Every structure is written in structure tokens, then in C-alpha cells.
């Protein structure tokens, strides 16, 4: 938000051509990836509409955090196999 502006001329147009198949090797995050692509489509309708962009930035904050928590689970999978604990959270 408060940061300087940056280029946005080609932020999305054709990436669906490979996201359409990439999502199927990502099925445990495809859920939030769909929510973020829906943000990116409310954004596609107006690329710098500030609620669309606030929405995309908010869903992207959740997307990136949940992907980091999924990578933390993968880094710990040998321990989770004996000490099972879901990594879904809000407080940190």
C-alpha cells in the first residue's frame, strides 16, 4: 500500500494457459490459488482498482503465508509422521 508505484502493464493475460495444468500438481493449495486467481480477475476487470488490489494483496498475504506454512510442514514431514499437527493458523 504505502510503497512507491511499480509497472503493471502485463501483470496477467495468458498465464491461465499453464496455471490450468500447474494447479493439478498443487491440489492442497489449489483452494487458495483459486481464491487468489478470483482476486486477480476482479483485478483483471480493473488492474489497479484499489479494492480489487487490496483484495488481491490481502488474499496474496494469506496465499504466501499458507504456502510458507506448507513448506514448513514438508521440511518437518519425518517428525509429523510421529507427532501429527495441522499447520493451519491465524495467531503466530
mmCIF file of C-alpha atoms in Angstrom:
data_model
loop_
_atom_site.group_PDB
_atom_site.id
_atom_site.type_symbol
_atom_site.label_atom_id
_atom_site.label_comp_id
_atom_site.label_asym_id
_atom_site.label_seq_id
_atom_site.Cartn_x
_atom_site.Cartn_y
_atom_site.Cartn_z
ATOM 1 C CA UNK A 1 0.000 0.000 0.000
ATOM 2 C CA UNK A 2 2.311 2.851 1.284
ATOM 3 C CA UNK A 3 5.188 1.757 -1.067
ATOM 4 C CA UNK A 4 6.084 3.671 -4.319
ATOM 5 C CA UNK A 5 4.179 2.633 -7.531
ATOM 6 C CA UNK A 6 5.588 -0.040 -9.933
ATOM 7 C CA UNK A 7 4.922 -1.278 -13.542
ATOM 8 C CA UNK A 8 1.685 -3.302 -14.106
ATOM 9 C CA UNK A 9 1.274 -3.313 -17.970
ATOM 10 C CA UNK A 10 1.359 -7.176 -18.300
ATOM 11 C CA UNK A 11 0.516 -8.464 -14.734
ATOM 12 C CA UNK A 12 -1.918 -11.122 -16.156
ATOM 13 C CA UNK A 13 -3.218 -12.003 -19.682
ATOM 14 C CA UNK A 14 -2.066 -15.534 -20.765
ATOM 15 C CA UNK A 15 -0.752 -17.301 -17.559
ATOM 16 C CA UNK A 16 -4.037 -19.335 -17.406
ATOM 17 C CA UNK A 17 -2.521 -21.427 -20.287
ATOM 18 C CA UNK A 18 -0.099 -23.050 -17.732
ATOM 19 C CA UNK A 19 -1.898 -22.308 -14.387
ATOM 20 C CA UNK A 20 -4.749 -24.530 -15.761
ATOM 21 C CA UNK A 21 -2.398 -27.581 -15.520
ATOM 22 C CA UNK A 22 0.048 -26.348 -12.786
ATOM 23 C CA UNK A 23 -2.850 -26.249 -10.225
ATOM 24 C CA UNK A 24 -3.245 -30.070 -10.560
ATOM 25 C CA UNK A 25 0.250 -30.675 -9.025
ATOM 26 C CA UNK A 26 -0.815 -28.227 -6.225
ATOM 27 C CA UNK A 27 -4.223 -29.715 -5.099
ATOM 28 C CA UNK A 28 -3.710 -28.961 -1.321
ATOM 29 C CA UNK A 29 -3.309 -25.193 -2.146
ATOM 30 C CA UNK A 30 -5.438 -25.092 -5.388
ATOM 31 C CA UNK A 31 -8.228 -23.955 -2.988
ATOM 32 C CA UNK A 32 -6.457 -20.674 -2.026
ATOM 33 C CA UNK A 33 -4.878 -20.386 -5.517
ATOM 34 C CA UNK A 34 -8.473 -20.273 -6.949
ATOM 35 C CA UNK A 35 -9.367 -17.545 -4.387
ATOM 36 C CA UNK A 36 -6.255 -15.569 -5.480
ATOM 37 C CA UNK A 37 -6.986 -16.036 -9.231
ATOM 38 C CA UNK A 38 -10.544 -14.771 -8.452
ATOM 39 C CA UNK A 39 -8.872 -11.727 -6.805
ATOM 40 C CA UNK A 40 -6.691 -11.385 -9.947
ATOM 41 C CA UNK A 41 -9.909 -11.475 -12.100
ATOM 42 C CA UNK A 42 -11.654 -8.744 -10.035
ATOM 43 C CA UNK A 43 -8.273 -7.082 -10.673
ATOM 44 C CA UNK A 44 -8.357 -8.083 -14.398
ATOM 45 C CA UNK A 45 -11.650 -6.146 -14.703
ATOM 46 C CA UNK A 46 -9.771 -3.070 -13.348
ATOM 47 C CA UNK A 47 -5.961 -3.737 -12.910
ATOM 48 C CA UNK A 48 -5.464 -1.014 -10.243
ATOM 49 C CA UNK A 49 -8.964 -0.750 -8.741
ATOM 50 C CA UNK A 50 -7.938 -0.221 -5.088
ATOM 51 C CA UNK A 51 -10.440 -2.702 -3.528
ATOM 52 C CA UNK A 52 -9.562 -5.291 -6.215
ATOM 53 C CA UNK A 53 -5.882 -4.618 -5.463
ATOM 54 C CA UNK A 54 -6.492 -4.538 -1.671
ATOM 55 C CA UNK A 55 -8.373 -7.854 -2.125
ATOM 56 C CA UNK A 56 -5.569 -9.387 -4.229
ATOM 57 C CA UNK A 57 -2.931 -8.101 -1.728
ATOM 58 C CA UNK A 58 -4.953 -9.498 1.271
ATOM 59 C CA UNK A 59 -5.598 -12.903 -0.367
ATOM 60 C CA UNK A 60 -1.925 -12.893 -1.529
ATOM 61 C CA UNK A 61 -0.810 -12.255 2.091
ATOM 62 C CA UNK A 62 -2.821 -15.398 3.070
ATOM 63 C CA UNK A 63 -1.627 -17.324 -0.059
ATOM 64 C CA UNK A 64 2.064 -16.640 0.584
ATOM 65 C CA UNK A 65 1.805 -17.357 4.369
ATOM 66 C CA UNK A 66 -0.077 -20.666 3.845
ATOM 67 C CA UNK A 67 2.494 -21.718 1.164
ATOM 68 C CA UNK A 68 5.308 -20.901 3.671
ATOM 69 C CA UNK A 69 3.489 -22.994 6.321
ATOM 70 C CA UNK A 70 3.075 -25.875 3.775
ATOM 71 C CA UNK A 71 6.861 -25.671 3.008
ATOM 72 C CA UNK A 72 7.477 -25.732 6.822
ATOM 73 C CA UNK A 73 5.289 -28.894 7.038
ATOM 74 C CA UNK A 74 7.258 -30.523 4.135
ATOM 75 C CA UNK A 75 10.567 -29.569 5.934
ATOM 76 C CA UNK A 76 9.166 -31.403 9.052
ATOM 77 C CA UNK A 77 7.334 -34.402 7.425
ATOM 78 C CA UNK A 78 9.602 -37.011 9.195
ATOM 79 C CA UNK A 79 8.524 -35.544 12.592
ATOM 80 C CA UNK A 80 4.818 -35.054 11.547
ATOM 81 C CA UNK A 81 4.739 -38.836 10.744
ATOM 82 C CA UNK A 82 5.108 -39.450 14.580
ATOM 83 C CA UNK A 83 3.922 -36.064 16.078
ATOM 84 C CA UNK A 84 0.983 -35.176 13.728
ATOM 85 C CA UNK A 85 -0.113 -31.479 13.929
ATOM 86 C CA UNK A 86 -2.084 -29.390 11.370
ATOM 87 C CA UNK A 87 -0.153 -26.213 10.331
ATOM 88 C CA UNK A 88 -3.328 -24.085 9.677
ATOM 89 C CA UNK A 89 -3.311 -20.979 11.980
ATOM 90 C CA UNK A 90 -4.042 -17.215 12.388
ATOM 91 C CA UNK A 91 -2.244 -16.333 15.679
ATOM 92 C CA UNK A 92 1.605 -16.649 15.346
#
